[PDB]
Design a protein around this ligand. Structure first.
Ligand SMILES: Cc1cc(CCCCCOc2ccc(C3=NCCO3)cc2)on1
Lengths: 273, 59, 59, 40, 255, 255, 57, 40
């Protein structure tokens, strides 16, 4: 492939460099339209800018935490982090978010990796070996109430059991209801006067719930869960302007008030170098 | 049940009206059934809210 | 107020004109539908799509 | 070799090697030739 | 003697002529088309009013003055009240449509000024409150009036800050969306053909707007000496290939 | 096992079933069809909303009692407010349509009574004043309510005398018009298909009604002993092959 | 596979929607027996409702 | 590839792709045609 062809002096009536940008086109002008060039080859394919590659590496999408401790006398397991859940979503952590929102609709399979590490902040004789049981709880399924409810039987709901310190990995097909996931949605769930506006209405994909299977030892053990997400088989439509201001909320476009100028001011003139 | 995803309403009204023969009286009833057309698709299995338990059963 | 054979019966009144016999939304996973076999199976899945067949038998 | 039955479980896809910027760079209704005048 | 410059668009019972055009943009290089069966889901036969809905509606005019910040209309909202298009809209459960948008602004060879005319698919607005305040319905359904970016923040309304496109992105990059400029010195109209863009084959026309049309002054209007300091901008829009489905009782929407 | 007796008519998104029909009449043995070019005059392409206008509208119900004289509806008037049919009607300059009329009245094998259901092309009514008094507009445009032949003379209204068909002809000869009887002992519905009948290819839908549908008790209703002395009669009507042409601003009509 | 075929107006002596449930059958009635439909395809096989799948986790 | 000798040790079965509701939806002795009268 040639990156530049050889081109010499020109004295024409045919001027490729004068255009009318009002038309909305970006005319494909090249170095050889306005200087004299020599042949050179590309030596490159643009492999690593493919959208599959761009969205295809694992990104941290969520960090939560649960603890193993005596539940005796706990009136609210959920509240003691005896188990915890996560209202699945991919917009909470914002590094991966800016990348996805370069597109309007996106379609992909997900590969999740879940790393779990334990901490024992206060005096323990040892490190126990805990098994985590993260289970997927889709919309309209008995949400779990204690850390050892019938829910955890999970007879119809996919669940994975792995050890703290290890990693769990599995992959979920594209579960969207439509043909693509909306990265943006300028609508409502119905024409009410006070119903929420955004995608949050849209992208209610149910939540994920984690717990330790082990009963309690004499000390307490903090287990912190990190969920990583990798898109595989990516398809993206309609590019948009990149995010400039900071994010404030999952699912709304809102930016913070009295934010700071995002364009760097010159130290000098327009004329400055 | 979800809003965005909601399916409508079903209602039924008298078009003319029920008329009973002589020597007859009172209310009459309709039985109503529901089944799915061959059209139907169900996906992404999960657990039913329709059954739960507090201790394991025994014999 | 307690489950009875009677909640399967939709009553009809003689001589009423223009009026409404019954009404329901179509959340097949809840409400009237929920205990029916259809309702009961739909609840093992997260998503449904398709046509429903609703019939009325007169008695 | 896929070891698994479902398609979601396969590895990343392979390069589009599609690449056609004209839907974005030249969505004009009447075709513009480089070198010919923009507005006639 | 055909110029890129003169054009005629006849759609239904209405025709537009421009003698000072700058080509026309067809979003993503695709022209509006009806919904194919292979893509269909709802089993209902759809209704295609054709020429009674696919004609040109001219919205009320705006006034560009030296202080203008820009205006924003949403589709199909802007047309919610135009003739039979609008009736069909409130009466069917689902509908789908593409449009031809023609923005008009003429001046003289002594004026200067340049407007950006851009179509943004799925333009989800931001609340000026920050945090996770929502933007109420009425605020994103201004109707033919559209939203005036130089109007004041209101409560439950969107933010109207132009350098941020009403969503946290910079004005400068709006050029990645199908758009055309109106530069008084060149141009006097802008025309964009919009194909139907959605993640579902057909949708509700009232709970979801699928494009915002935005006209933004970028190089300020500068009139000749002792000229009146303003120009009107007119927007005329025509639904094209419209289809409605799931007819019934007639939606009632807030406010 | 097909009987003349059971029938199903599906039109648009609406279906009717009768288990006690008496065949169906198709006026003048012709079925509704669109307007051919060879017969066309107006050069405008017409709009054919199809399934959104060609469905069944059920008008409000009447009550047959022993004192009833008969009721009269005019078309397209009776439908002037039904869904998108009606909108189209007020919004185009010209329109054209055929209809399926289904009149319903069920009783039991102890009742007796017989209604005449007849369609009269161009039913010009008479003033009860005599002389050359006219019948004002409002009076001949009752809408879905229709005209109740047992209501009182009003001023500027038509005469409501049944033995004279509201025009100086005898009830007995209405049988020369497409018609069907509903005899409680036989029948429970009447169905008539009306092709478009006019002296022009397309006309105005508001200044001219082209058929009156008339339901007239002829053998008085007789209920079984100690039965309630009345039965409701319901009329459901569906425009078929409708076409509208000459779209614009939306007619404003008296009252 | 078609999920719905195209079907238009009907004025028949052949009524598929009237049945006798006393018989114990569920007659296979479809949208196209009582409204006007357009063609649409299934795009789906019913894979995840197989009893092997239902009892297999 | 089965690594084991016994049939019980193989993975899940594969979709019946059988599907015939008529034993459940139409177990009537004399065949009913849709459109023909239910009771003659
Ligand atoms: C955009 C966008 C991204 C998302 C997330 C979609 C992923 C589908 C649901 O995700 C899961 C997560 C976990 C599990 C799980 N099963 C057993 C253990 O974890 C299953 C599906 O939603 N919208």
């Amino acid at each position: 492939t040639v990156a530049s062809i050889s081109s010499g002096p020109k004295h024409t009536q045919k001027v490729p460099i004068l255009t009318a940008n009002e038309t909305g086109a970006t005319m494909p002008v090249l170095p050889s339209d306005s200087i004299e060039t020599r042949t050179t080859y590309m030596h490159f394919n643009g492999s690593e800018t493919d959208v599959e590659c761009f969205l295809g590496r694992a990104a941290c999408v969520h960090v939560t935490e649960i603890q193993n401790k005596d539940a005796t006398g706990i009136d609210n397991h959920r509240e003691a982090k005896l188990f915890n859940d996560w209202k699945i979503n991919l917009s909470s952590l914002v590094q991966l978010r800016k990348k996805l929102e370069l597109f309007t609709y996106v379609r992909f399979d997900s590969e999740y990796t879940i790393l779990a590490t334990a901490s024992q902040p206060d005096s323990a004789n040892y490190s126990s070996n805990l098994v985590v049981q993260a289970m997927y709880v889709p919309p309209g399924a008995p949400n779990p109430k204690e850390w050892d409810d019938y829910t955890w039987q999970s007879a119809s709901n996919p669940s994975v059991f792995f050890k703290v310190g290890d990693t769990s990995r599995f992959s979920v097909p594209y579960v969207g209801l439509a043909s693509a996931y909306n990265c943006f949605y300028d609508g409502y769930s119905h024409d009410d006067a006070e119903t929420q506006y955004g995608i949050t209405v849209l992208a209610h994909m149910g939540s994920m719930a984690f717990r330790i299977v082990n009963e309690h030892d004499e000390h307490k053990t903090l287990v912190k869960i990190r969920v990583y997400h990798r898109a595989k088989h990516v398809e993206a439509w309609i590019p948009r302007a990149p995010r400039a201001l900071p994010y404030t909320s999952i699912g709304r476009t809102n930016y913070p008030k009295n934010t700071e100028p995002v364009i760097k001011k010159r130290k000098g003139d327009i004329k400055s170098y | 049940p979800d809003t965005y995803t909601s399916a409508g309403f079903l209602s039924c009204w008298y078009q003319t009206s029920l008329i009973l023969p002589p020597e007859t009286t009172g209310q009459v009833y309709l039985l109503s059934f529901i089944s799915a057309c061959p059209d139907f698709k169900l996906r992404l299995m999960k657990d039913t809210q329709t059954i739960s338990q507090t201790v394991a059963l025994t014999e | 107020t307690k489950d009875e054979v009677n909640s399967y019966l939709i009553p009809l009144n003689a001589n009423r004109q223009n009026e409404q016999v019954f009404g329901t939304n179509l959340f097949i996973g809840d409400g009237v539908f929920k205990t029916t076999l259809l309702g009961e199976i739909v609840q093992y899945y997260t998503h449904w799509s398709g046509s429903l067949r609703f019939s009325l038998m007169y008695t | 070799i896929n070891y698994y039955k479902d398609a979601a479980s396969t590895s990343s896809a392979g390069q589009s090697l599609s690449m056609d910027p004209s839907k974005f760079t030249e969505p004009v209704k009447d075709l513009m030739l480089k070198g010919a005048p923009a507005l006639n | 003697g055909y110029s890129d410059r003169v054009q005629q668009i006849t759609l239904g019972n209405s025709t537009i002529t421009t003698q000072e055009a700058a080509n026309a943009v067809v979003c993503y290089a695709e022209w509006p088309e009806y919904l194919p069966d292979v893509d269909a889901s709802d089993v209902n036969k759809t209704s295609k009013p054709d020429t009674s809905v696919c004609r040109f509606y001219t919205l009320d005019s705006k006034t560009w003055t030296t202080g203008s910040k820009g205006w924003c209309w949403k589709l199909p909202d802007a047309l919610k009240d135009m003739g039979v298009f609008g009736q069909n809209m409130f009466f069917h459960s689902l509908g789908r449509s593409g449009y031809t948008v023609h923005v008009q602004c003429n001046a003289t060879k002594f004026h200067s000024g340049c407007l950006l005319v851009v179509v943004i698919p799925e333009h989800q607005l931001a609340s000026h409150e920050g945090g996770n305040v929502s933007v109420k319905y009425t605020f994103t359904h201004p109707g033919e009036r559209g939203i005036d970016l130089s109007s004041a923040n209101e409560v439950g309304g969107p933010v109207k800050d132009v350098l941020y496109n009403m969503n946290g992105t910079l004005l400068g990059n709006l050029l990645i969306f199908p758009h055309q400029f109106i530069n008084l010195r060149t141009n006097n109209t802008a025309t964009i053909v919009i194909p139907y863009i959605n993640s579902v084959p057909i949708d509700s026309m009232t709970r979801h707007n699928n494009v915002s049309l935005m006209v933004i002054p970028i190089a300020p209007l500068t009139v000749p000496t002792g000229a009146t300091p303003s120009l009107p901008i007119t927007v005329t829009i025509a639904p094209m290939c419209t289809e409605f489905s799931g007819i019934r009782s007639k939606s009632i929407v807030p406010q």
